RNA sequence: UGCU
């Protein structure tokens, strides 16, 4: 009697994606920031006034962002498209407007609409022009319908604000110190200040440490200062256990050693220990009330809640001092994800505060001593301050908020347009707070808390392994709630007030503490009933579905989380060994009677947090459901991310193989969108004949990657041929490459600017310099048109000019010097289009789109969607390629020796499924933890007449005799990578050198030479080739001849020593230029190296 | 010499001289492409 | 972008059958029997016609015109 | 050990790039430090006078 | 002018990433090699305007 | 919209029904071509609205 | 930022 299984259960994922998913997170965050958070910030800073000249004020009424507009026209707004912004290298922002009221000369004057700044509008947002548009309108606006969006366009470049991952605030963390002292820490962060206070047991007693105290003081003194002076009450609050009293005894003894017994004495001691920023007593009380533990509120200098909080902290420390139950930082249940909305809100608040301060300063400087003419803010309301601030913060990526003392870098990154998959995977990346500080390996390791939230296999391979992560296919990020009804329900559910009872009740085994966002909500008994009622109410809908509730029995604490940034995942509710969702509900969803919101409202599917699933039980499948089950997994394949979703049958391969496959798919070559022809980027790679994979995954169908594939399916035969596929290499077919297989197109952009300087002069394009001998343009200016601009359709060779630009040297007749834009390239390029635009600064921007059609050759890198990266080793002709009975020759021959060590059975399964699909005219599915089985494809093969194992009778093409072993033929989806041997080839002649040190440059684009690093020098030393090392590091790199005086040992010039004013003891000497520079720097540093020369004999 | 260009949305042949505000008639779009050359270009089928 | 004229593995003329395959798709013929009726015995041309994506019209929708 | 004269190095150690695209040039930090030192010496002399 | 033949047909032709002013008649190399900056060198040169450097 | 190189490659992949026995191989160079060893095919298509 |  097997449990019935709902087959259409996977239909819950598309319905969820219809309203949430991959890119909806940033869109919703930006919409909330521009709709509610900006209004809240404006209301917080609504009124600003100056101390001098009272009765003067500036009141803000309502702020608007408007629709995206461009300031190109002469004081005229005009709708501008994101594609136009990309073409013109401008910003896609909307004018921020506000209505204000002020008093000029005590007469109230109001303004209904006044611009104050420009906010870069995110694409596909609420106010974006792309939203609510059909694909026809997208085509009219020159934008791809499948484009994920969610990124900003500033100065033509596409920047994406990555999701930052930090530790949860207002939470006690018990951990070992540097030397190994088990202590506690708490970082109380409110809307104004953020203070971290620690507590250590370095000498058996609890010392509290804060940044505002000269020296750490005992906790008992702080207890006595915070109102509670009875040692009995302090001990009862700490705990009533024998070991607790034994551990706390030293603290009581140390406190009794001193004469501190009253609140006044304790406050005096604290004030004496307070650092400079009874007066000392007042400062100590103020620090204890506001500075220390800011998250714990005090009604009116009532430190009861703070006393209970520190008592619970000390109790946790005492409990941890025994059994090593140390909390881990890598537990994602205590992590918070800050989307772009919160960052933009903080930045806007800081910029608005700075603008208000500047306006107040200007008023204080202008109003009292200017003139009887009454001053008003409108004459000094800076409209470019906010615009420039936002543009710089989005472009440079460095955020420096002084009001919060936050100095972050790398917040924004250039959106990688290598492929649609690359852009979609980069849009859903997560950066960590560590940012490669230490090779801890803790946060870099894969924690079990990442189940269903982040992709386990998707991680960049390199130094950033483990710090850069991607979200799962099905997940959500919560926002902030009001916390009103939550507190009301908690109070109504019988939660006793903490102030009503003493701390002795905290030591009982049945009394469980309840916390709310780090604040002690109170105490409770029989927490099972409380949790059950809270969950039932949340399912009913009276409480927000995103409010998480968790219970830890080791500490007896029930946490109620309602802050934003928490990761949640939908789960089907299971009650009494039967899920709530049934076949009838799935059929209704398929027909359209209900949706995911209806499922959420009907208590069928609910969102679970990491802390909530820590206590709740989840089932993978229906057959796994037992008596002790509360939820059911929707789909197992959703564990993988977007980049990992392309892997066909990933559960049959190795984890490093999947990681490498995701890393290479982030660079896979293919189409970007339907507007790739009109799109003009600095570097683009396209495929001539892209084909969708035969073995496509449900994730592929969801992300619509089949519409924009990034590879081709080729008849690959796994065998060894000619020994040119020794180590991961492959052999390509000459005829296949000739017939268009693997053909790629490289598009490069060359931009030129003709700007007007301060003087009334402008850069001009000169016509082609015709040769008077032949009455035709010279070889360099051959491709130029009549206007001096290269025309499309022609070919460009090396050292040829594209724009014959000439600029003045004055900034009487202007003197123009030529600075043409020469083309640096080994191979020829063809001009496809030449776009000419005019900016508001009368500057002419000219962009020429160069194209290069390259054929796969030796050295090109290829991937097979399984991390089996390879390089083209040899290109054998078709007659040399083997043939089967049907006459089919393999296009790619891969090394079978790479299968045993890598355990890539998934590649074989994908090949078999693809062969079956191309035989039966179907598309097999390689869904993770499922998909088409091997038996089905074997049956398809045996029905179509081919072998049930893929191996077929093949005859050798060279000798014409059959092979002793059968060859494994089949269609495999191979994708070409951007790594080209034509671009990676380098050869450096003498070339140029650096001004500071006369050595070759670094990069290849600047014609740089190779570096014989310290390891190379060590190898040469070990070999003992002294002459070779000398010729490498002195003769061929920085050879130079200096003049050294044999009397003083200093460096001369032209055989003359200025120090001694003589030239008899001066002699030439070979020396590296770097060594000469070192000697000069030492002489500047007053460390004079005196060289005593002598004969070589 | 009459220099000809093409609008980004109208796709109409517009003639403008040097040092002129880049614009197209019966519209206000400011994207102007250059027509393909009339010279003979040889391509290889390889 | 557009259907290739020649097949990668063998080299049979297949670009001339793209419109015929589209017409068969518009008719009641399935993928399998359409590819069988088109005369493609070996699976290479079947894969070439089946795994091909039609993006030329999508690009022409953005073409200047 | 107590210095009364500072040895300004040659221009080979202090490379200067003439950025004609704007009204400025790229100078190393040593030049700015020496300029600040000279300014401070002049200010000290002015205060003494 | 060329130091060997005295001709004034001096052309700047870069031969495989090597700037070189060479005579077009006899091929006599007049000058070769140019001293550029490097990226780390470029980054460590600070931008100072004429408004401060000039005085 | 199709690239010039892709168009040339597609045209090269198009077979010709001409009898090869009646022609000869073109010598090294000679891009102008001779009547014996060359064939010219013109393709002029102008698309317009109906 | 990517590559081994
Ligand atoms: C990347 O996100 C950040 C991180 O760069 P850092 O390593 O923090 O830069 P650094 O600390 O200053 O390194 P170093 O001292 O060696 O110079 O910065 C961007 N980024 C850094 N380095 C590169 C690079 O070499 N190439 C590219 N394309 N981007 C780089 C990244 O956004
Ligand atoms: Mg390697
Ligand atoms: Zn001397
Ligand atoms: Zn127009
Ligand atoms: Zn074929
Ligand atoms: Zn000469």
mmCIF file with all atom_site columns, N, CA and C in Angstrom, chain F residues 3-29:
data_model
loop_
_atom_site.group_PDB
_atom_site.id
_atom_site.type_symbol
_atom_site.label_atom_id
_atom_site.label_alt_id
_atom_site.label_comp_id
_atom_site.label_asym_id
_atom_site.label_entity_id
_atom_site.label_seq_id
_atom_site.pdbx_PDB_ins_code
_atom_site.Cartn_x
_atom_site.Cartn_y
_atom_site.Cartn_z
_atom_site.occupancy
_atom_site.B_iso_or_equiv
_atom_site.pdbx_formal_charge
_atom_site.auth_seq_id
_atom_site.auth_comp_id
_atom_site.auth_asym_id
_atom_site.auth_atom_id
_atom_site.pdbx_PDB_model_num
ATOM 1  N N  . UNK F 1 3  ? 25.596 38.589 -41.355 1.00 0.00 ? 3  UNK F N  1
ATOM 2  C CA . UNK F 1 3  ? 26.947 39.098 -41.538 1.00 0.00 ? 3  UNK F CA 1
ATOM 3  C C  . UNK F 1 3  ? 27.470 38.754 -42.928 1.00 0.00 ? 3  UNK F C  1
ATOM 4  N N  . UNK F 1 4  ? 28.364 39.609 -43.431 1.00 0.00 ? 4  UNK F N  1
ATOM 5  C CA . UNK F 1 4  ? 28.930 39.393 -44.759 1.00 0.00 ? 4  UNK F CA 1
ATOM 6  C C  . UNK F 1 4  ? 29.722 38.092 -44.819 1.00 0.00 ? 4  UNK F C  1
ATOM 7  N N  . UNK F 1 5  ? 30.518 37.814 -43.784 1.00 0.00 ? 5  UNK F N  1
ATOM 8  C CA . UNK F 1 5  ? 31.311 36.586 -43.767 1.00 0.00 ? 5  UNK F CA 1
ATOM 9  C C  . UNK F 1 5  ? 30.421 35.353 -43.677 1.00 0.00 ? 5  UNK F C  1
ATOM 10 N N  . UNK F 1 6  ? 29.380 35.407 -42.843 1.00 0.00 ? 6  UNK F N  1
ATOM 11 C CA . UNK F 1 6  ? 28.455 34.281 -42.734 1.00 0.00 ? 6  UNK F CA 1
ATOM 12 C C  . UNK F 1 6  ? 27.722 34.070 -44.052 1.00 0.00 ? 6  UNK F C  1
ATOM 13 N N  . UNK F 1 7  ? 27.320 35.163 -44.705 1.00 0.00 ? 7  UNK F N  1
ATOM 14 C CA . UNK F 1 7  ? 26.663 35.052 -46.003 1.00 0.00 ? 7  UNK F CA 1
ATOM 15 C C  . UNK F 1 7  ? 27.590 34.429 -47.039 1.00 0.00 ? 7  UNK F C  1
ATOM 16 N N  . UNK F 1 8  ? 28.856 34.857 -47.062 1.00 0.00 ? 8  UNK F N  1
ATOM 17 C CA . UNK F 1 8  ? 29.815 34.286 -48.003 1.00 0.00 ? 8  UNK F CA 1
ATOM 18 C C  . UNK F 1 8  ? 30.043 32.806 -47.728 1.00 0.00 ? 8  UNK F C  1
ATOM 19 N N  . UNK F 1 9  ? 30.122 32.427 -46.451 1.00 0.00 ? 9  UNK F N  1
ATOM 20 C CA . UNK F 1 9  ? 30.293 31.021 -46.102 1.00 0.00 ? 9  UNK F CA 1
ATOM 21 C C  . UNK F 1 9  ? 29.089 30.192 -46.534 1.00 0.00 ? 9  UNK F C  1
ATOM 22 N N  . UNK F 1 10 ? 27.877 30.713 -46.320 1.00 0.00 ? 10 UNK F N  1
ATOM 23 C CA . UNK F 1 10 ? 26.678 29.998 -46.748 1.00 0.00 ? 10 UNK F CA 1
ATOM 24 C C  . UNK F 1 10 ? 26.634 29.850 -48.263 1.00 0.00 ? 10 UNK F C  1
ATOM 25 N N  . UNK F 1 11 ? 27.008 30.905 -48.993 1.00 0.00 ? 11 UNK F N  1
ATOM 26 C CA . UNK F 1 11 ? 27.041 30.823 -50.449 1.00 0.00 ? 11 UNK F CA 1
ATOM 27 C C  . UNK F 1 11 ? 28.083 29.816 -50.922 1.00 0.00 ? 11 UNK F C  1
ATOM 28 N N  . UNK F 1 12 ? 29.238 29.770 -50.254 1.00 0.00 ? 12 UNK F N  1
ATOM 29 C CA . UNK F 1 12 ? 30.243 28.779 -50.595 1.00 0.00 ? 12 UNK F CA 1
ATOM 30 C C  . UNK F 1 12 ? 29.778 27.356 -50.354 1.00 0.00 ? 12 UNK F C  1
ATOM 31 N N  . UNK F 1 13 ? 28.973 27.143 -49.311 1.00 0.00 ? 13 UNK F N  1
ATOM 32 C CA . UNK F 1 13 ? 28.427 25.820 -49.034 1.00 0.00 ? 13 UNK F CA 1
ATOM 33 C C  . UNK F 1 13 ? 27.374 25.387 -50.046 1.00 0.00 ? 13 UNK F C  1
ATOM 34 N N  . UNK F 1 14 ? 26.901 26.293 -50.891 1.00 0.00 ? 14 UNK F N  1
ATOM 35 C CA . UNK F 1 14 ? 25.892 25.947 -51.893 1.00 0.00 ? 14 UNK F CA 1
ATOM 36 C C  . UNK F 1 14 ? 26.572 25.207 -53.041 1.00 0.00 ? 14 UNK F C  1
ATOM 37 N N  . UNK F 1 15 ? 26.117 24.008 -53.394 1.00 0.00 ? 15 UNK F N  1
ATOM 38 C CA . UNK F 1 15 ? 26.711 23.288 -54.522 1.00 0.00 ? 15 UNK F CA 1
ATOM 39 C C  . UNK F 1 15 ? 26.295 23.884 -55.859 1.00 0.00 ? 15 UNK F C  1
ATOM 40 N N  . UNK F 1 16 ? 27.098 23.584 -56.876 1.00 0.00 ? 16 UNK F N  1
ATOM 41 C CA . UNK F 1 16 ? 26.872 24.053 -58.238 1.00 0.00 ? 16 UNK F CA 1
ATOM 42 C C  . UNK F 1 16 ? 26.740 22.836 -59.144 1.00 0.00 ? 16 UNK F C  1
ATOM 43 N N  . UNK F 1 17 ? 25.731 22.853 -60.015 1.00 0.00 ? 17 UNK F N  1
ATOM 44 C CA . UNK F 1 17 ? 25.455 21.734 -60.908 1.00 0.00 ? 17 UNK F CA 1
ATOM 45 C C  . UNK F 1 17 ? 26.387 21.691 -62.116 1.00 0.00 ? 17 UNK F C  1
ATOM 46 N N  . UNK F 1 18 ? 27.347 22.607 -62.208 1.00 0.00 ? 18 UNK F N  1
ATOM 47 C CA . UNK F 1 18 ? 28.255 22.637 -63.344 1.00 0.00 ? 18 UNK F CA 1
ATOM 48 C C  . UNK F 1 18 ? 29.123 21.382 -63.389 1.00 0.00 ? 18 UNK F C  1
ATOM 49 N N  . UNK F 1 19 ? 29.417 20.934 -64.604 1.00 0.00 ? 19 UNK F N  1
ATOM 50 C CA . UNK F 1 19 ? 30.266 19.764 -64.795 1.00 0.00 ? 19 UNK F CA 1
ATOM 51 C C  . UNK F 1 19 ? 31.721 20.153 -64.557 1.00 0.00 ? 19 UNK F C  1
ATOM 52 N N  . UNK F 1 20 ? 32.400 19.566 -63.569 1.00 0.00 ? 20 UNK F N  1
ATOM 53 C CA . UNK F 1 20 ? 33.789 19.968 -63.295 1.00 0.00 ? 20 UNK F CA 1
ATOM 54 C C  . UNK F 1 20 ? 34.783 19.493 -64.341 1.00 0.00 ? 20 UNK F C  1
ATOM 55 N N  . UNK F 1 21 ? 34.459 18.448 -65.108 1.00 0.00 ? 21 UNK F N  1
ATOM 56 C CA . UNK F 1 21 ? 35.393 17.937 -66.106 1.00 0.00 ? 21 UNK F CA 1
ATOM 57 C C  . UNK F 1 21 ? 35.643 18.934 -67.228 1.00 0.00 ? 21 UNK F C  1
ATOM 58 N N  . UNK F 1 22 ? 34.720 19.863 -67.460 1.00 0.00 ? 22 UNK F N  1
ATOM 59 C CA . UNK F 1 22 ? 34.856 20.850 -68.519 1.00 0.00 ? 22 UNK F CA 1
ATOM 60 C C  . UNK F 1 22 ? 35.643 22.082 -68.091 1.00 0.00 ? 22 UNK F C  1
ATOM 61 N N  . UNK F 1 23 ? 36.058 22.157 -66.830 1.00 0.00 ? 23 UNK F N  1
ATOM 62 C CA . UNK F 1 23 ? 36.823 23.281 -66.308 1.00 0.00 ? 23 UNK F CA 1
ATOM 63 C C  . UNK F 1 23 ? 38.198 22.800 -65.853 1.00 0.00 ? 23 UNK F C  1
ATOM 64 N N  . UNK F 1 24 ? 39.016 23.750 -65.401 1.00 0.00 ? 24 UNK F N  1
ATOM 65 C CA . UNK F 1 24 ? 40.369 23.468 -64.945 1.00 0.00 ? 24 UNK F CA 1
ATOM 66 C C  . UNK F 1 24 ? 40.627 24.229 -63.653 1.00 0.00 ? 24 UNK F C  1
ATOM 67 N N  . UNK F 1 25 ? 41.730 23.882 -62.993 1.00 0.00 ? 25 UNK F N  1
ATOM 68 C CA . UNK F 1 25 ? 42.114 24.545 -61.756 1.00 0.00 ? 25 UNK F CA 1
ATOM 69 C C  . UNK F 1 25 ? 42.719 25.912 -62.050 1.00 0.00 ? 25 UNK F C  1
ATOM 70 N N  . UNK F 1 26 ? 42.360 26.896 -61.230 1.00 0.00 ? 26 UNK F N  1
ATOM 71 C CA . UNK F 1 26 ? 42.932 28.228 -61.370 1.00 0.00 ? 26 UNK F CA 1
ATOM 72 C C  . UNK F 1 26 ? 44.377 28.230 -60.887 1.00 0.00 ? 26 UNK F C  1
ATOM 73 N N  . UNK F 1 27 ? 45.254 28.876 -61.655 1.00 0.00 ? 27 UNK F N  1
ATOM 74 C CA . UNK F 1 27 ? 46.658 28.954 -61.288 1.00 0.00 ? 27 UNK F CA 1
ATOM 75 C C  . UNK F 1 27 ? 46.834 29.788 -60.018 1.00 0.00 ? 27 UNK F C  1
ATOM 76 N N  . UNK F 1 28 ? 48.064 29.797 -59.508 1.00 0.00 ? 28 UNK F N  1
ATOM 77 C CA . UNK F 1 28 ? 48.370 30.560 -58.305 1.00 0.00 ? 28 UNK F CA 1
ATOM 78 C C  . UNK F 1 28 ? 48.116 32.043 -58.544 1.00 0.00 ? 28 UNK F C  1
ATOM 79 N N  . UNK F 1 29 ? 47.202 32.614 -57.766 1.00 0.00 ? 29 UNK F N  1
ATOM 80 C CA . UNK F 1 29 ? 46.807 33.995 -57.959 1.00 0.00 ? 29 UNK F CA 1
ATOM 81 C C  . UNK F 1 29 ? 45.761 34.147 -59.044 1.00 0.00 ? 29 UNK F C  1
#
